[PDB]
C-alpha cells in the first residue's frame, strides 16, 4: 500500500556479477542496518568467476558497496595418506546470504571437493560450502558439512547410501532466533536432498583454517530414505523456520521439495530432529510447488502461517487451454494441535510466463494496521514482461485477495527484478518497514521505503 515507488534507492555491483541474486538486512552490534548482497559470478583473483559478497551501508543515494572479503584460494591438505582438495572456481559464493545477530552467512553451493588416495578418488563433486563473517571484528569461519573422505569404490559397494557428495550445502539457508544455522542441500543423498544444522557459535569455535575436514559435534543432519517418492525431490531447495507445534521451546523447520513424488512437489514441516509433522502436497506436476516458502502470521492471531510459491503453475483457461502464470498458496495455522488444512487462499498470476510466486517476502506490518503483510514477486510479470512485485495485506481472515500496490521493475528487460526479496526491516528508522528487491540480471538492488499511509 504505502511503499514509495517515486524515490527509490539503487545499489549496483560489477557487470556480469549477478549482484542482487541474494540479499538480506544486516544489523551491526549497535543496531545500524545495512544490506548484505550476494553476487555469485563476481570475478576472483585468477580472473575466474567465484562469486563475492558486498556489505552496503544505508544511504538514500545508494551507489557502490565495499566488499565483504572471503578466502577465494583453492586449498590442498596432505594428511592421513590422503589428499584433500577444495575447488572454488564457479562455486557461486553469494548464491545465498543471510544475517543473524552481527554475523553474516554467505554460501557457495557449487564449491567442489575431492579426496585423492593413490590411484583412487572420492570424485570431484559439488558438496557446497558456507562462509561466516563477523564484520566488525574480522572473524571468519567456514561450515561445509557434506565434505567426506570416503573413496568412490565404497559408495558403489554400498549402493550409494548416505551419499553426500552432491549436497550443494547452502543452496538455501536460514538461522533460528537462537542462532542455529540451517542449510538446505537439495543434492544431498544422491539428489533426495538433506538439511544440515549447527549453532553459529559452534561453527566459529570448532573452525581453524587449513584443516578442511573437521567435526562440529553439535551438528545435526537429516536422513537418507528408501522411499522413491523422495528420489530427485530436491528437498531443501528452500527452507524457513517458525512455530507450528504449540510448544514455544521448540523451533520447527519448513522445507521445500519442489520435485517431490515425480515432480508433484511438496513442502514439509518438521521438528528440529527432522521428524515430519505435516506435509503439503503440490497441486500440479512440474509447477515447482515449494520453490519458495514463507512463514509469517498474516491474520493477527499470533500463530505463524505458511505461504508456498509454485511459480510454474498453469492456470486453466477457456477452450481447455492452460497458461503458465504461477500461484501462491496460503495456509493458516489452526488453533492448538491440529493439521494444517486445505489452503485458505489461492493467489494466481496473470502474465504468461511471469513466474508469480518465485519469491515471497514477509513485510511485517507495512501499513501499521495490526496485521502482517507480504510481497510476492513475478520476476517476468507485468504487461512488458520486465517483472513486478505485488503487495498483499493481512486481515482477520488471512490475506486480501487483491494487491494493495504493484511495483513495476525500474530495470530493463531480463533483469529478473524480484527474484530475491527481503522485507520487515526499517532501514531508515522512520517507523515503517521497508523492502529490498534484487535484480541480479541488471546487477542491482532497489530499496523501496515505506511512508505514512496516504
Amino acid at each position: 500500500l504505502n511503499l514509495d515507488p517515486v524515490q527509490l534507492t539503487f545499489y549496483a555491483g560489477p557487470n556480469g556479477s549477478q549482484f542482487g541474486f541474494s540479499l538480506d538486512f544486516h544489523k551491526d552490534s549497535h543496531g545500524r542496518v545495512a544490506i548484505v548482497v550476494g553476487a555469485p559470478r563476481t570475478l576472483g583473483p585468477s580472473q575466474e568467476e567465484t562469486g563475492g559478497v558486498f556489505l552496503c551501508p544505508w544511504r538514500a543515494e545508494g551507489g557502490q558497496c565495499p566488499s565483504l572479503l572471503f578466502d577465494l584460494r583453492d586449498e590442498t591438505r596432505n594428511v592421513g595418506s590422503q589428499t584433500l582438495q577444495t575447488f572454488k572456481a564457479r562455486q557461486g559464493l553469494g548464491a545465498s546470504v543471510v544475517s543473524w545477530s552481527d554475523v553474516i552467512v554467505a554460501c557457495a553451493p557449487w564449491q567442489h571437493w575431492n579426496v585423492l588416495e593413490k590411484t583412487e578418488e572420492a570424485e570431484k563433486t559439488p558438496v557446497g560450502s558456507c562462509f561466516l563473517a563477523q564484520p566488525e571484528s574480522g572473524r571468519r569461519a567456514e561450515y561445509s558439512p557434506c565434505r567426506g573422505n570416503t573413496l568412490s569404490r565404497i559408495y558403489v559397494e554400498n549402493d550409494f547410501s548416505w551419499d553426500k557428495r552432491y549436497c550443494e550445502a547452502g543452496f538455501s539457508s536460514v538461522v533460528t532466533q537462537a542462532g542455529e544455522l540451517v542449510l538446505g542441500a537439495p543434492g544431498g543423498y544422491y539428489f533426495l536432498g538433506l538439511l544440515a544444522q549447527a549453532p553459529v557459535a559452534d561453527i566459529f569455535s570448532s573452525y581453524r583454517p587449513g584443516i578442511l575436514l573437521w567435526h562440529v559435534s553439535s551438528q545435526s543432519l537429516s536422513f537418507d530414505s528408501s522411499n522413491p517418492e523422495y528420489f530427485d525431490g530436491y528437498w531443501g531447495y528452500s527452507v524457513a523456520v517458525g512455530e507450528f507445534d504449540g510448544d514455544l521451546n521448540t523451533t520447527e523447520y519448513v522445507v521445500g521439495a519442489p520435485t517431490w513424488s515425480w515432480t508433484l512437489g511438496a513442502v514439509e514441516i518438521l521438528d528440529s530432529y527432522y521428524q515430519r509433522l505435516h506435509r503439503l502436497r503440490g497441486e500440479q506436476m512440474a509447477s515447482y510447488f515449494g520453490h519458495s516458502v514463507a512463514v509469517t502470521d498474516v491474520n493477527g492471531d499470533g500463530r505463524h502461517d505458511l505461504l508456498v510459491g509454485a511459480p510454474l503453475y498453469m492456470e486453466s483457461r477457456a477452450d481447455r487451454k492452460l497458461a503458465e502464470v504461477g500461484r501462491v498458496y496460503l495456509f493458516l495455522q489452526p488453533r492448538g494441535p491440529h493439521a494444517l488444512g486445505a489452503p485458505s487462499l489461492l493467489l494466481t498470476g496473470t502474465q504468461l510466463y511471469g513466474r508469480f510466486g518465485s519469491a515471497i517476502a514477509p513485510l511485517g506490518d507495512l501499513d501499521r494496521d495490526g496485521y502482517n503483510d507480504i510481497a510476492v514477486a513475478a520476476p517476468y510479470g507485468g504487461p512488458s514482461g520486465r517483472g513486478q512485485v505485488l503487495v498483499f495485506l493481512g486481515q482477520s481472515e488471512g490475506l486480501r485477495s487483491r494487491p494493495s500496490q504493484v511495483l513495476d521493475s525500474p530495470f530493463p528487460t531480463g533483469s529478473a527484478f524480484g527474484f530475491s526479496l527481503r522485507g520487515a526491516v526499517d532501514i531508515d528508522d522512520n517507523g515503517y518497514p521497508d523492502l529490498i528487491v534484487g535484480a541480479y540480471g541488471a546487477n542491482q538492488v532497489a530499496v523501496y521505503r515505506a511512508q505514512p499511509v496516504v
Partner: antibody, heavy 119, light 108 residues
C-alpha cells in the same frame, strides 16, 4: 563432556585371547574415528589401528595385522580391541583415542586398560 | 614409516622457566603433528593439534610451532603440573607414529 571409559585390567595366559572395550561417554561413538594405541616403557607408544564406527571400516599398522582386530557396536556406543595368540610382548597398556575437531587428530584419550600375559 | 625423533629425552628445569621440546620427522609432514601430555601414573591429554592449534581447555602458556619436518612445543613459565611426559605424533601418513617422549624433571 567427552569421556572414553575403558574396561578393567586383564590378566591372561599366553596363547589365549582378550577383548578390550572403549565406551563413549557424553557423545555418539559414531561421530569420529576411534584409534587404538599400545604403550610400553621401553618401546614407547605404538599406533595399532583405527575404526570408523559409522561403517566398520578399519586400518592397521602391518605390525599388528593378525593380532589386533578392532570392532564397534553403535548400539552399546562402544568400540573394541581384540587381541589373539597373546605373548609376553603383548603385555602393555592399551588406549582408545579420538580427535577433537581435526578428522585425523589424536586429542581425547581413554584412561587405559592394563594387560598382563603370564603363565 | 615416518620416524619421529623427539629431543631431548629429558630436561632438568625449574618453575617459571621457558622450555622448548623439539620433534624432527624423517620427511615433511606439513604441520600434521599433535602434542600430548601424560602426567605421572595417569592417562594422556591432548595439547596441540595441526602444529599450532590448542586443544580446548589447554592453558595458553603452551604453544606449538614449526614447519616441514621440524616442530617445537614451548611452555612459557612452567607450572608445578607441567612436570610430566610429553610426546609428539604425526598423522600425515598411516601408520601414525610417535616420538620417543620427553620427561620434564625438577632441577635441584
Amino acid at each position: 563432556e567427552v569421556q572414553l571409559q575403558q574396561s578393567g585390567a586383564e590378566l591372561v595366559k599366553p596363547g589365549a585371547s582378550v577383548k578390550l572395550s572403549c565406551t563413549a561417554s557424553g557423545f555418539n561413538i559414531k561421530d569420529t574415528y576411534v584409534h587404538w594405541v599400545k604403550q610400553r616403557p621401553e618401546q614407547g607408544l605404538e599406533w595399532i589401528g583405527r575404526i570408523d564406527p559409522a561403517n566398520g571400516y578399519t586400518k592397521y599398522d602391518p605390525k599388528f595385522q593378525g593380532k589386533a582386530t578392532i570392532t564397534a557396536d553403535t548400539s552399546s556406543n562402544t568400540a573394541y580391541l581384540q587381541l589373539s595368540s597373546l605373548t609376553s610382548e603383548d603385555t602393555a597398556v592399551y588406549y582408545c583415542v579420538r580427535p577433537l575437531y581435526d578428522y585425523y587428530a589424536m586429542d581425547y584419550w581413554g584412561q587405559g586398560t592394563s594387560v598382563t600375559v603370564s603363565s | 614409516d615416518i620416524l619421529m625423533t623427539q629431543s631431548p629425552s629429558s630436561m632438568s628445569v625449574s618453575l617459571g622457566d621457558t622450555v622448548s621440546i623439539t620433534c624432527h620427522a624423517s620427511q615433511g609432514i606439513s604441520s600434521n603433528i599433535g602434542w600430548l601430555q601424560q602426567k605421572p601414573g595417569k592417562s594422556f591429554m591432548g595439547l596441540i593439534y595441526y602444529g599450532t592449534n590448542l586443544v580446548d581447555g589447554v592453558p595458553s602458556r603452551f604453544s606449538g610451532s614449526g614447519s616441514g619436518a621440524d616442530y617445537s612445543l614451548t611452555i612459557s613459565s612452567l607450572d608445578s603440573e607441567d612436570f610430566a611426559d610429553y610426546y609428539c605424533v604425526q598423522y600425515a601418513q598411516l601408520p601414525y607414529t610417535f616420538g620417543g617422549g620427553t620427561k620434564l624433571e625438577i632441577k635441584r
